[PDB]
Ligand binder design. Structure first.
Ligand SMILES: O=C(O)[C@H]1CNCC(O)(O)[C@H]1O
Length: 458
């Protein structure tokens, strides 16, 4: 029988207002070597972003940001015209790539077709300040201040050493002098250049002193997060992915304190399920839709300004897979982001679960939407327990449910939202939308194990 849980929505318990550009994706800077990829002509990839949000952020960076070399006279290799750069697996040095004005021209048209804003990595790992100044100037010239949210001066500088980019002795003090040199050079060329940093996992030895030192030089703090890894570790399972992650709660609390001490908001500029490109059997499954949807709400409730799920190529954890030549598809994780896209923006509300200790991985979020209608995003992340949710605190003549479903937690396909798969170019409409049982003040919703649901009340 289902676990019988109570959900109390409290319209007077005001949480954070979710911004309209909360959602986003992160890609490898190597992908900019292919001017066909981030292009006005990539109508397929553009459709997938527009469906994730009318407003959102495209972040370009990753380990490949230390291996990409902007040049004003560069042209793409014939290999570059066909490159699909998936997530760097973080074993060896990435391949050297060149970025061309043509690729930056085409990125502008892509941002025009998607309506999204840009976070743009610069090569602090291996490049020169003067070349970063020049690439920033061209990007400002072509993208504009309105669409360009921030430059980032290196990716995971705290990992440079492990990755062979700097010697073992490289520390925050060394990165701060590097950061200051790039910053100064870029500002000579681009006086209004916006920045974010330090573009790594929260920690005490890099992210906290970054904020204190560079607080007058940045728009916001940029953090990374992987739930799991390494992928060779048999610990890293769907079971563990469905559980609360105490490292995440701590880093989130670290970010809120930085915001208190410096006034700087925080965005999770690079995140996914499992690091080193993801884990087959975990990252590429329906479980990843429950994890991603849940994370978006959890970080929104904590006061995050937004999120950027890393992906590209056919990476195990990519929300969107494919190429201009072969087309694009929505991986399971995409469906978690689609639930958030359909909820829309508004102000988070109090939503308390009781009688739920035998279904402890059920999470719930209530939202007063910008259109005034109440919504509830539920993730039944229990792999073995069905739930029956008695919903109080909502007075409404009628609620509907869109279900986030696959026949098994580990399915790599068979993922639907609202009784429908995503189609070509991000096309989606609900084909199954049932009413929630009960009346004003007492709704009852069933959810099978390992399912999700979005409730919308009139
Ligand atoms: O999957 C991973 O480990 C990522 C970690 N951050 C940098 C990168 O995005 O390039 C990836 O290597």
């Amino acid at each position: 029988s289902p676990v019988r849980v109570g959900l109390s929505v409290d319209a007077s318990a005001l949480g954070h207002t979710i911004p309209p550009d909360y959602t986003g994706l992160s890609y490898e800077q190597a992908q900019m070597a292919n001017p066909n990829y981030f292009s006005g002509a990539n109508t397929q990839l553009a459709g997938f972003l527009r469906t994730l949000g009318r407003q959102g952020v495209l972040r370009i960076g990753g380990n490949t940001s230390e291996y990409t070399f902007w040049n004003r006279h560069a042209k793409p290799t014939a290999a570059d015209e066909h490159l699909a750069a998936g997530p760097d697996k973080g074993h060896h040095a990435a391949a050297r790539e060149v970025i061309t004005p043509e690729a930056v021209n085409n990125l502008s048209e892509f941002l025009d077709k998607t309506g999204w804003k840009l976070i743009y990595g610069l090569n602090l790992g291996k490049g020169t300040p003067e070349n970063a100044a020049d690439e920033a100037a061209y990007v400002m010239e072509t993208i504009g201040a309105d669409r360009l949210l921030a430059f980032q001066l290196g990716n995971e500088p705290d990992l440079f050493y492990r990755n062979g980019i700097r010697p073992a002795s490289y520390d925050f003090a060394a990165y701060a002098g590097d950061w200051q040199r790039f910053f100064t050079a870029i500002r000579k060329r681009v006086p209004n250049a916006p920045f974010a940093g330090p573009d790594t996992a929260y920690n005490t030895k890099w992210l906290v002193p970054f904020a204190d030192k560079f607080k007058h030089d940045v728009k916001f703090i940029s953090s990374h997060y992987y739930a799991e890894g390494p992928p060779t570790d048999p610990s890293m399972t769907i079971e563990r992915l469905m559980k609360p992650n105490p490292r995440l709660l701590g880093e989130t609390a670290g970010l809120k304190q930085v915001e208190a001490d410096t006034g700087l908001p925080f965005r999770l500029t690079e995140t996914n399920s499992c690091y080193q490109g993801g884990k087959q059997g975990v990252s590429d499954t329906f479980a990843a839709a429950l994890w991603a949807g849940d994370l978006m709400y959890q970080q929104a409730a904590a006061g995050s300004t937004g999120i950027n799920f890393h992906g590209g190529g056919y990476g195990w954890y990519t929300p969107v897979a494919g190429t201009p030549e072969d087309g694009f598809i929505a991986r399971p994780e995409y469906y978690g982001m689609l639930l958030f896209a359909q909820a829309g923006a508004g102000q988070l509300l109090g939503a308390k679960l009781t009688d739920n200790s035998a279904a402890p991985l059920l999470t719930a979020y209530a939202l007063r939407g910008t259109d005034g209608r109440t919504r509830i995003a539920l993730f039944n992340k229990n792999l073995d327990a069905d739930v029956e949710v008695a919903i109080s605190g909502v007075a409404s003549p009628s609620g509907t449910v869109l279900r986030l479903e696959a026949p098994r937690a580990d399915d790599t396909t068979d993922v639907t939202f609202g009784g429908a798969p995503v189609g070509a170019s991000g096309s989606w409409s609900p084909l199954v939308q049932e009413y929630v049982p009960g009346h004003s003040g007492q709704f009852v919703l069933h959810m099978r194990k390992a399912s999700g649901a979005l409730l919308e009340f009139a």
